[PDB]
Design a protein around this ligand. Sequence first.
Ligand SMILES: [Mg+2]
Ligand SMILES: [Mg+2]
Ligand SMILES: [Mg+2]
Ligand SMILES: [Mg+2]
Ligand SMILES: [Mg+2]
Ligand SMILES: [Mg+2]
Ligand SMILES: [Mg+2]
Ligand SMILES: [Mg+2]
Ligand SMILES: [Mg+2]
Ligand SMILES: [Mg+2]
Ligand SMILES: [Mg+2]
Ligand SMILES: [Mg+2]
Ligand SMILES: [Mg+2]
Ligand SMILES: [Mg+2]
Ligand SMILES: [Mg+2]
Ligand SMILES: [Mg+2]
Lengths: 124, 26, 143, 214, 176, 41, 97, 46, 202
Amino acid sequence: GADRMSKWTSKRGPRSFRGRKGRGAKGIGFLTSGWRFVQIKEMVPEFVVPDLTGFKLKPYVSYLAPESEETPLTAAQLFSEAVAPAIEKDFKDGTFDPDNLEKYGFEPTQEGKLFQLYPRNFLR
Amino acid sequence: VKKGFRAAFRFQKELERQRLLRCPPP
Amino acid sequence: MARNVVYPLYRLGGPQLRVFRTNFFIQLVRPGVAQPEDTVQFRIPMEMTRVDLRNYLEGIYNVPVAAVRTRVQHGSNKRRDHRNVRIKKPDYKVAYVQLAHGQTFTFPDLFPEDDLYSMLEEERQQRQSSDPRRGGVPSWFGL
Amino acid sequence: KSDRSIHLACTAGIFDAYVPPEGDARISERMKKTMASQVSIRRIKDYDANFKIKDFPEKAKDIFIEAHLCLNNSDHDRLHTLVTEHCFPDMTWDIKYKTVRWSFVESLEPSHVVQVRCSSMMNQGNVYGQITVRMHTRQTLAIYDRFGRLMYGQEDVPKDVLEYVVFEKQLTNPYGSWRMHTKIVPPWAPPKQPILKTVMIPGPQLKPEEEYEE
Amino acid sequence: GLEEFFDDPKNWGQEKVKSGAAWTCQQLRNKSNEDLHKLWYVLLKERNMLLTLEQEAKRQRLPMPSPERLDKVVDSMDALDKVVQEREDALRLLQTGQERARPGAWRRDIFGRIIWHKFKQWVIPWHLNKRYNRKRFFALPYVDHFLRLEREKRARIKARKENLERKKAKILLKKF
Amino acid sequence: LRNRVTDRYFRIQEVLKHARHFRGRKNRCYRLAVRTVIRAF
Amino acid sequence: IGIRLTLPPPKVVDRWNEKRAMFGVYDNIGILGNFEKHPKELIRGPIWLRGWKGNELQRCIRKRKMVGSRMFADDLHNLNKRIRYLYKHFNRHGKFR
Amino acid sequence: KARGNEYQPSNIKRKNKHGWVRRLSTPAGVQVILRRMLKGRKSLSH
Amino acid sequence: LPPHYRYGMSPPGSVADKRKNPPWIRRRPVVVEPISDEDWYLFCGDTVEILEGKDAGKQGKVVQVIRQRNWVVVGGLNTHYRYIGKTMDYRGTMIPSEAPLLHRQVKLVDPMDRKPTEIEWRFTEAGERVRVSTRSGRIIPKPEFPRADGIVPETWIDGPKDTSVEDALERTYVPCLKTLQEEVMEAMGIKETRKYKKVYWY
RNA sequence: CCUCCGCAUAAGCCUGCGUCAGAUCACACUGACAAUUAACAGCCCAAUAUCUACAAUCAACCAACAAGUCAUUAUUACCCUCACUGUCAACCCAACACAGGCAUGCUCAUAAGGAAAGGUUAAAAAAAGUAAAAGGAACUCGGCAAAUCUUACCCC
RNA sequence: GCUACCUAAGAACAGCUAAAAGAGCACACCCGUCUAUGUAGCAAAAUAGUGGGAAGAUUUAUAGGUAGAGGCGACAAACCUA
RNA sequence: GCUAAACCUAGCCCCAAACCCACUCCACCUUACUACCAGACAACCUUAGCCAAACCAUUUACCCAAAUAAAGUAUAGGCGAUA
Ligand SMILES: [Mg+2]
Ligand SMILES: [Mg+2]
Ligand SMILES: [Mg+2]
Ligand SMILES: [Mg+2]
Ligand SMILES: [Mg+2]
Ligand SMILES: [Mg+2]
Ligand SMILES: [Mg+2]
Ligand SMILES: [Mg+2]
Ligand SMILES: [Mg+2]
Ligand SMILES: [Mg+2]
Ligand SMILES: [Mg+2]
Ligand SMILES: [Mg+2]
Ligand SMILES: [Mg+2]
Ligand SMILES: [Mg+2]
Ligand SMILES: [Mg+2]
Ligand SMILES: [Mg+2]
């Protein structure tokens, strides 16, 4: 009989089976005409690598560092530290319109945006 | 392992008897 | 490029697929067989494309790259444990990167040539071997 | 890289050996020698202020007699209390399957404390003190075989002995004691008693291509 | 270059290369996004160096000089990933109110189990999709007996675990 | 396996002690010993 | 050889446990308590075997009735096969007709 | 003639015959996979 | 670790422990009293008194705690003798070896009487759990053992790949309502004018 | 000395005689470390309508029957690249280092590939051959086997 | 995935006779007449020799089809995983 | 004196009680464990037989909504077996 316990890879099966299965690398283009491959640049991932000249953060931290209590960032903390000053400083001045929250940051829709948070359209 | 005590006790007295007829006491 | 993440679909006329924090991690490996002077061998993930190893090495390490070739190396499934269950050595991707501008790489040599242990060595050096003429007599009694 | 390490209760050597003087047995710089000693003796009394070097020699003789008597009955527990871990194997290993019959007849002359030296502190936080004591006694010895046959010595006959026994106590340890560490045999020592059997020393077992070159 | 895949040449064969503590998640929360991006690439180059060194140690049958460096760089980048994902999760929950980044649905299956179908990205709609309509998100009535037998097996395993729990407790109280 | 026989040894020896002067496997193998010990009695 | 070579671990018994010491108490609760309870209501066990004996066929018929509804499938099937086998054995086989 | 060489392997045949998609294609094959998950098999299909 | 693993003197993963406990070992489990973390009196470096066996009534410093078997290894005490370096017909050197002791075989000592006491855990005014004696009533602190990592703070000089405590703690994060991708694109000045069109998600 | 083999592809299998270290018919076993790199092969193609009678056989002559394996056009639409995967071995199906089974191209004649004898003695019986005086089917159910290479005739 | 029959699209067949062939000799290839060996074997049907066919109702690679109250069969009550 | 022999613990059984189990990421109905394309198909039919009737041909108990009792009673049934 055949081995039905190991992983089914692209190394097994006949020519057609071997060429039609891959290893999980994402596609960077399409196939046309005489099995001719057209690579599409926008489908090729571009590595956004920053300038590291003048950077003071090294891979390890000195052991002479004070211990800090862990505090996971919440949406409550983000609201209290990002838009709450604006809302308070606009209410005490008395110019809060409860219909234009767009000026405080609120995004009604995520459409038309380049980096939409739901459904996510951006890589890590 | 079988349950019980009586056969094990009998076997120990048999073992003690043979050890005596093997290395007899002075 | 990145592992284990959904990729945003591209419809013609759309933005560039950009990655910002890639989780692609490669190893420079000493070649087992003899290679040309321009060849650098890497072990890369299965989901890393040669277009992305070129882009990775030219973006993060600023290495001019002329050619990239890849192969899939199979790990053995022959080995068995005490339950007669086969243990799988993994599969990896090997990549051969040929450098540009006439540059040349050779793999360097990264490995060039206790009170208890000193106690053990001192006792071993103090303990002389038994004299044959002593016959087997204990050698401590001064008598 | 565990935080537990071996807690050694002795050392593996002799601290500044007493080169036995030629003529010490044939006849029936001193300030520096006895200076190193006094400096160290004070170190020992820093670690325990009830030590008298005038009181050591009789204790050393008692430890000697009782240790060597353990070798007669094989009391390895008492031996580990009157002798160091450095002295245990080279006192027991060659007697393991033999019968040792030892006795102490008398002492020809009283025992003398003849050297006191101490190690530094940097031995793992432990500081040891090592005292050399000369002995000239009269002992008997008869080492028997696995089958009860004589190999060495005579049963009743006492013979003279000169030994420079080096005792050691670990001073930092709270329950440390004075135990027998080694003994110096002089390089000028008299030759020992002949054994009771004949011995063949083999020559070179030669491979066939080799030639016997005398 | 490739000298950045290798260590400093003065560290080669030094049997121990000292290190520093891994980045703690709170410290990475103190730093900003752009600095976390740059630190991600610094830590990435360090991890590539350490993985290269570990593979060459395996090749030469010698111990790796200090594997704690590799462990601590993996912890540092895990903490960085955690911080960035928390910031995105907080903004997504603030702006859209959705608690996951990928869409999905609780659905049934051809086997009668309830699964979290994670959605895939398509160009045509679902009624026109061939492969999607070949898949069955419903259990026909011959699955209920196997569901009952599956539940009964889970009950037989739980009852065993809890009886042994009590037997082990009584054996402990027998000894002490 | 509640209630098993635990003294079968002593039963086999009660038969076997009367066969120890016999010749062959019947002096030690119970299945042949019994047949010959009943006949000796 | 099928006999222990050593003595078994000793089997110490407390004849004065709370359970041993109070065995049998309230077993005359009806005749000494104005017949308000029954010792069969003192019995604690399976719900189909409180104050009833039966043989094996009667026990199997009784359990399928009181708890065959709330019963696992494999164990119910096995009970049905057991009742069928015991019906055939008790009604058709034996030495005494 | 001589027997025993009745398995003439072919991956296309083995996947078309006893594979997951064929199994799920019939309800009885669905119950074959259900029977194997209940037994706890590590290879439900081929 | 495999179930019913027998903890011993060697750490679980060493060469001696891989020899003692192979992947196929199945031994009888060791029955261990369930002593919780909220009631473990023995720590490392604490001075205890051995009460049972040879070395009875004797005070030492514990050098190892194995919580999985309620074991303390007191430094130098409960000792047996074993050779080390037995390679050729060389005997090796006899070393003293410590056998572990149980928490009912050791008892903590109060720092003045230097006699066996009994500690009961009691929160203090600062909320610090503190070992309070039962005969007397003072506080025995947790003894300072060097560290688990092996890093001693006083002699810590940062190397070429360690970030300075100052830079490590420089707060650069202004909390905003934008993403790392959005911020990094603005910072690095990448420009994108093409719009991401709607994708049917199912 | 043998070569009825061989070398490739296909299918199948899936690290299965590469290096290092290590044991206990004769020394392909265990653990570790490596390796198969695309141009060969796989993986193809916008729509709607529309078009497509005349074999192959050296395609010529010629003869066929069983009557055959290879073709477009019109008008819209259309900018971009060399991705992904197979690539090792003494190998697969026959419970086995099984005298069996196993598609195609080349060599079929060897430039590939291999070894019938562990050592001796030289009894019977048995196996496989070679030679055999005179005779020549007398053998046997039968010229079975072997050797020659050979006539005529029944029944179905 | 054997085998019986079928579908789709493939492949192979030297040399000689006569040139018309379900023609003859004859390889590869397909089968299996007779004998000997083997009979827990090399083999749950093999080996050596001898044979039948070998341009045809041939042989054969691949994918597909028909399933048991059935299928399939140039009827042997054949074959449908020893 | 070789081969051996011994061993108590993994765990399990019957009850009681109590309503059991599903989103690290990613992948998975196509040749499952395959990023990414013009379709659509779709679930519901009385079990039967072994066996007993000493063959067998009508017939031959199979939880169906807490115990007990009425009661193996009325009834049914090649008025047989049996129900
Ligand atoms: Mg090509
Ligand atoms: Mg090849
Ligand atoms: Mg050759
Ligand atoms: Mg040969
Ligand atoms: Mg031979
Ligand atoms: Mg002739
Ligand atoms: Mg004739
Ligand atoms: Mg005749
Ligand atoms: Mg013939
Ligand atoms: Mg013909
Ligand atoms: Mg012919
Ligand atoms: Mg036919
Ligand atoms: Mg017929
Ligand atoms: Mg017939
Ligand atoms: Mg009948
Ligand atoms: Mg009958």
